[PDB]
Design an enzyme around this catalytic site. Structure first.
Site, PDB file in Angstrom:
ATOM      1  N   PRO A  44      37.646  36.012  41.477  1.00  0.00           N
ATOM      2  CA  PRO A  44      37.907  37.028  40.464  1.00  0.00           C
ATOM      3  C   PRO A  44      37.050  36.853  39.218  1.00  0.00           C
ATOM      4  O   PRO A  44      36.480  35.770  38.996  1.00  0.00           O
ATOM      5  CB  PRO A  44      39.380  36.822  40.138  1.00  0.00           C
ATOM      6  CG  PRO A  44      39.968  36.253  41.384  1.00  0.00           C
ATOM      7  CD  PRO A  44      38.865  35.685  42.233  1.00  0.00           C
ATOM      8  N   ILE A  96      38.796  40.897  44.534  1.00  0.00           N
ATOM      9  CA  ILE A  96      38.847  41.388  45.903  1.00  0.00           C
ATOM     10  C   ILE A  96      40.303  41.307  46.354  1.00  0.00           C
ATOM     11  O   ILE A  96      40.788  40.245  46.710  1.00  0.00           O
ATOM     12  CB  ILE A  96      37.901  40.601  46.843  1.00  0.00           C
ATOM     13  CG1 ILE A  96      36.439  40.779  46.408  1.00  0.00           C
ATOM     14  CG2 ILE A  96      38.062  41.086  48.278  1.00  0.00           C
ATOM     15  CD1 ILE A  96      35.486  39.733  46.959  1.00  0.00           C
ATOM     16  N   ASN A 142      40.878  46.886  32.027  1.00  0.00           N
ATOM     17  CA  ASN A 142      40.624  47.695  33.213  1.00  0.00           C
ATOM     18  C   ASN A 142      40.641  46.822  34.465  1.00  0.00           C
ATOM     19  O   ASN A 142      39.922  45.819  34.540  1.00  0.00           O
ATOM     20  CB  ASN A 142      39.294  48.438  33.084  1.00  0.00           C
ATOM     21  CG  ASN A 142      39.370  49.583  32.081  1.00  0.00           C
ATOM     22  OD1 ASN A 142      40.144  49.538  31.135  1.00  0.00           O
ATOM     23  ND2 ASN A 142      38.582  50.607  32.294  1.00  0.00           N
TER      24      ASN A 142
END
Ligand SMILES: O=C(O)c1cc(-c2c[nH]nc2F)ccc1Oc1ccc2ccccc2c1
EC number: 5.3.2.1
Lengths: 114, 114, 114
Positions: A1, A64, A97
């Site tokens: 990440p 992911i 976001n």
């Protein structure tokens, strides 16, 4: 990440150990080993939130998988908490976001995660 | 809505009032209250557009809805106009990436907008 | 396409010619004229990859189509190769996020590409 923070808070106000703390906290939260966690803090930015230049942050978290309704609410609580405590940014002046990346669309080590 | 401008134009060339003008005109364009509008301007960047280091800009506009064919054309006219007028960047050396964000994927104030 | 590199490598370690090399090599790899290619390099960043502050990069490649399994792998080999050769960043400390943009969602020259 991958977690990115852009903020108008000055460089001297970012505690030593903030990057390491984000790495550890995100490894726990995403359920992923810390080796895959990338963190990026960009202070001294020319930005405004609601027309105001009081401390604020514009952030993103790419992963992911491990992205969705409840997980994003839990990440927002975590990350706003860290931004409040460490950078003294109010939670209502932070945007994060969230991006759920397909493995084939993340390059790494001369290839992708596909 | 969140608007970010990255540019090779120097910091001294960004006029006073630019962040406030961007907020107001985005509020005018999107109809959305200025309180939720975030703007971010990043001068002095090392960038090229078509292999040239003449003034250019790479931008993004993220919005929860208010994104689409006609709307993005309208935003492009507005934002290129502002960049041309205020930063002296030619419209043909500007890219603006538009993102229609799901409310569940925007964090704010310890939660998300879902 | 548009290619952005964020890195903790210092500005002085970015070699002269790097933006131009990126432009030419991306033009070559995508089979597109260099006039469409935008590149952006951001050195001196406060970042970690796997909790380590050794050289690393967080990148993005946005293209209107021409994004996919095989093409993304080819781009990752190319771009990791350049970051390794020019910036001395190990390929396993690089992330490249790939985005297939809809033409309606890319602004340029007062309109969009739709
Ligand atoms: O090479 C690209 O795909 C490309 C990408 C960007 C871009 C900027 N920010 N994010 C992006 F993706 C801008 C211009 C580009 O050249 C075009 C533009 C329009 C096209 C329309 C149809 C087919 C190919 C096209 C190629």
């Amino acid at each position: 990440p991958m977690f990115i923070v852009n903020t108008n808070v000055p460089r001297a106000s970012v505690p030593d150990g903030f990057l390491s703390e984000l790495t550890q906290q995100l490894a726990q939260a995403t359920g992923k080993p810390p080796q895959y966690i990338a963190v990026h803090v960009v202070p001294d930015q020319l930005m405004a939130f609601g027309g105001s230049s009081e401390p604020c942050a514009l952030c993103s978290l790419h992963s992911i998988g491990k992205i969705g309704g409840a997980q994003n609410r839990s990440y927002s609580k975590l990350l706003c908490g860290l931004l409040a405590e460490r950078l003294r940014i109010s939670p209502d002046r932070v945007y994060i976001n969230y991006y759920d990346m397909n493995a084939a669309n993340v390059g790494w080590n001369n290839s992708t995660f596909a």
